[PDB]
C-alpha cells in the first residue's frame, strides 16, 4: 500500500511549530534509562534555555508527568501500557505498535517487544533493532495504521488505533468493523517497520544536527 501519507503526517506532527523534532531523540534516550526525566536535565543535554524546553513540552499535550512535574512518558513511557518495550534489563512501555518499531533506531538499542493481538488477545512478540526486525511471533503478524490528525491528542487520535495483530486476515476482519477511522490500513509488521525507517531517515534530515 501507499505509506507516504502516513510518513508525511507523522513527521509534520513533530515538525510542527515548537514540535518535539529536536527534543525527541535525547528525551527518548533519557526515558530509556527507566527514570523520570527533569526539564533541567533535558535543558542541560540540549543546551537550551528552560523557556524553550517548556514551550516544546507545552504543545505535546499527551506528555505524562509525575507528582514533581518530571517527565514519565512521551511515546516511550514508565507507565504500563499494552506494548512492552524491554531494553537492557529495564521493563519499559510504548504508546503504540509503531512506536516500538521506531524507537530502537533512535535510541541506538535493540528491544524485546511484546503485546497481545487487539482482535483476539493472542500473545505477540518480536525483536526490534536499529536496522531489522527478527523473532516475529507469529510470523504473519500485522499492524493497524490510521492517518494522524494534526491538532488532535496524538494518543486518542493515533496511538490507540495502532495495534499488533496475530495475522493480516485477522486484522482485516477487525478493520471491516472500524471503517469510521480515517485512513485505516492493515499492513504486515515488516511493512510497518519500513514505514518507521522512512520516518526516521526523514526525521534525521531535519534535526538541525
Ligand atoms: Hg503512538
Swiss-Prot record:
Its EC number is 4.99.1.2. GO terms for molecular function: alkylmercury lyase activity. It is an enzyme of class 4 (lyase). The keyword NAD does not apply. GO terms for biological process: response to mercury ion. It catalyses: an alkylmercury + H(+) = an alkane + Hg(2+). Cleaves the carbon-mercury bond of organomercurials such as phenylmercuric acetate. One product is Hg(2+), which is subsequently detoxified by the mercuric reductase. NCBIfam families: lyase_MerB, PRK13239.1. HAMAP family: MerB (MF_00714). This is Alkylmercury lyase. It comes from Escherichia coli.
